[PDB]
Write an enzyme that holds these catalytic residues in place. Structure first.
Site, PDB file in Angstrom:
ATOM      1  N   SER A   1      -0.535  15.248 -11.828  1.00 23.74           N
ATOM      2  CA  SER A   1      -0.689  15.020 -13.370  1.00 23.74           C
ATOM      3  C   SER A   1      -0.878  16.501 -13.741  1.00 23.74           C
ATOM      4  O   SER A   1      -1.470  17.957 -13.952  1.00 23.74           O
ATOM      5  CB  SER A   1      -2.332  14.132 -13.747  1.00 23.74           C
ATOM      6  OG  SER A   1      -2.453  13.941 -14.498  1.00 23.74           O
TER       7      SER A   1
ATOM      8  N   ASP B   1       0.793  -0.989   0.366  1.00 26.61           N
ATOM      9  CA  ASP B   1      -0.236   0.061   0.248  1.00 26.61           C
ATOM     10  C   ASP B   1       0.506   1.483  -0.184  1.00 26.61           C
ATOM     11  O   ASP B   1       1.221   1.166   0.874  1.00 26.61           O
ATOM     12  CB  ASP B   1      -1.036  -0.048   1.318  1.00 26.61           C
ATOM     13  CG  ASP B   1      -2.119   1.315   1.279  1.00 26.61           C
ATOM     14  OD1 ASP B   1      -1.938   2.157   0.367  1.00 26.61           O
ATOM     15  OD2 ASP B   1      -2.602   1.192   2.377  1.00 26.61           O
TER      16      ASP B   1
HETATM   17  O1  LIG Z   1      -7.337   4.341   1.394  1.00 26.06           O
HETATM   18  C1  LIG Z   1      -8.311   3.539   0.999  1.00 26.06           C
HETATM   19  C2  LIG Z   1      -7.248   1.780   1.451  1.00 26.06           C
HETATM   20  N1  LIG Z   1      -6.153   1.362   1.837  1.00 26.06           N
HETATM   21  C3  LIG Z   1      -5.721   0.434   2.459  1.00 26.06           C
HETATM   22  C4  LIG Z   1      -6.343  -0.329   2.794  1.00 26.06           C
HETATM   23  C5  LIG Z   1      -6.719  -0.939   4.248  1.00 26.06           C
HETATM   24  C6  LIG Z   1      -7.177  -2.349   3.290  1.00 26.06           C
HETATM   25  C7  LIG Z   1      -7.004  -2.355   2.503  1.00 26.06           C
HETATM   26  O2  LIG Z   1      -6.131  -1.660   1.963  1.00 26.06           O
HETATM   27  C8  LIG Z   1      -8.359   0.883   1.750  1.00 26.06           C
HETATM   28  C9  LIG Z   1      -9.481   0.128   3.071  1.00 26.06           C
HETATM   29  O3  LIG Z   1     -10.442   1.545   2.838  1.00 26.06           O
HETATM   30  C10 LIG Z   1     -10.347   2.415   1.734  1.00 26.06           C
HETATM   31  O4  LIG Z   1      -9.331   1.338   0.948  1.00 26.06           O
HETATM   32  C11 LIG Z   1      -9.711   3.940   1.147  1.00 26.06           C
HETATM   33  N2  LIG Z   1      -9.688   4.625   0.455  1.00 26.06           N
HETATM   34  C12 LIG Z   1     -10.697   4.025  -0.980  1.00 26.06           C
HETATM   35  C13 LIG Z   1     -10.824   4.129  -1.934  1.00 26.06           C
HETATM   36  C14 LIG Z   1     -10.977   6.302  -1.460  1.00 26.06           C
HETATM   37  C15 LIG Z   1     -10.393   6.697  -0.677  1.00 26.06           C
HETATM   38  C16 LIG Z   1      -9.767   5.702   0.186  1.00 26.06           C
END
Ligand SMILES: O[C@H]1[C@H](NCc2ccco2)[C@H]2CO[C@H](O2)[C@@H]1N1CCCCC1
Ligand SMILES: O[C@H]1[C@H](NCc2ccco2)[C@H]2CO[C@H](O2)[C@@H]1N1CCCCC1
Length: 330
Positions: A199, A35
């Site tokens: 961008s 991530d």
């Molecule tokens: O920041 C992301 C997260 N990323 C890390 C994570 C946790 C579990 C898997 O990945 C996951 C969990 O909540 C959502 O998606 C969040 N969200 C996505 C849409 C746009 C705004 C931010």
């Protein structure tokens, strides 16, 4: 040193990607979600509330001869979807694709929210944003990349995500066979702890390119592409019957549609996201309404170049003293 690991979609929609990671001695292999939008390496563990574990592989620090409790350290994180997890911290040996870091902070979950429990395919997260976002208290900890950096042949990692297929995370080198043409590098701000860049604009389908600055983050841990409402409306206006549904939670479109591509600018270069990449399938099983892969960032507070965008490119996360991002077509 270098490392190279294959990353694999968790489902038929590329909702997320998992990469095997070796933790401890003997190795315990867990499948983590890499991530670039966060900075904690946390895992399902033998300490996780039993009712909150449903099929995940767990890290058991008591079975690792190299695990050491990081005394007094705790962590707690919330993400955008309202999901969360928290726990305590061990240091241990962590290897990714042959690259080994000793003394890596491994954040052991005592609690995880329902969305984590419900996803049996993800055993935890490996954060690759800047260590300033790490949540460990009272002593903030470094990311895997931060710890590995000095040992790497070059202070970089690359993301090469597949469309409906596996891809690759490399550490310490740029695989010049993995992309076409040249890599265009662009400036990064680390002020919010993210791989944040600007961008240079966009096009919809075969339409003319609109030059406009769009600040956002390169985020492998977000599935979709979140952009300003103006841009998103211009995209979906080219799809007959598409509409934004508050009840569904964004733009939906008829599953019978053929979607146009979406192009984003990186300096003078252009990355084209094929229309098929923007289809996230029926909103519920058997529905003829499909969920869109380009959604509005209004309300999020930041634009997010998530997997939908990144998987169209070979992406270099350059962690030199002044970080930059590189994008190439592939
Ligand atoms: O920041 C992301 C997260 N990323 C890390 C994570 C946790 C579990 C898997 O990945 C996951 C969990 O909540 C959502 O998606 C969040 N969200 C996505 C849409 C746009 C705004 C931010
Ligand atoms: O839960 C997601 C789905 N995720 C993949 C999927 C399909 C079946 C199970 O999981 C896809 C299909 O419809 C939408 O996007 C749905 N939607 C997202 C915005 C608000 C919450 C609900």
């Amino acid at each position: 040193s270098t490392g190279s690991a294959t990353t694999t979609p968790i489902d038929s929609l590329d909702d997320a990607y998992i990469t095997p990671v070796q933790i401890g001695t003997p190795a315990q292999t867990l499948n983590l979600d890499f991530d670039t939008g966060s900075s904690d390496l946390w895992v399902f563990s033998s300490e996780t509330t039993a009712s909150e574990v449903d099929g995940q592989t767990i890290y058991t620090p008591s079975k690792s001869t190299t695990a050491k409790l990081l005394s007094g350290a705790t962590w707690s994180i919330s993400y955008g979807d309202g999901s969360s997890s928290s726990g305590d911290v061990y240091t241990d040996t962590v290897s990714v694709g042959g690259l080994t870091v000793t003394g890596q902070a491994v954040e052991s979950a005592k609690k995880v929210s329902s969305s984590f429990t419900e996803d049996s395919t993800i055993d935890g997260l490996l954060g690759l944003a800047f260590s300033t976002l790490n949540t460990v208290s009272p002593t903030q900890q470094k990311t895997f990349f931060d710890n590995a950096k000095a040992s790497l042949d070059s202070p970089v990692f690359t993301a090469d995500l597949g469309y409906h297929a596996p891809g690759t995370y490399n550490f310490g080198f740029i695989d010049t066979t993995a992309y076409t043409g040249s890599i265009t590098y662009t400036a990064v701000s680390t002020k919010q702890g993210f791989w944040e860049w600007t961008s240079t604009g966009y096009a919809v389908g075969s339409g003319t390119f609109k030059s406009t600055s769009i600040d956002g983050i390169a985020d492998t841990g977000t599935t979709l592409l979140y952009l300003p409402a103006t841009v998103v409306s211009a995209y979906w206006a080219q799809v007959s019957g598409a509409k934004s549904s508050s009840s569904v939670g964004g733009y939906v479109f008829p599953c019978s549609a053929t979607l146009p591509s979406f192009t984003f600018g990186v300096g003078s270069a252009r990355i084209v996201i094929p229309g098929d990449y923007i289809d996230f399938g029926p909103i519920s099983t058997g529905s003829s309404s499909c969920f869109g892969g380009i959604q509005s960032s209004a309300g999020i507070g930041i634009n997010i170049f998530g997997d939908v965008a990144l998987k169209a490119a070979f992406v270099v996360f350059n962690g030199a003293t002044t970080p930059t991002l590189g994008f190439a077509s592939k």
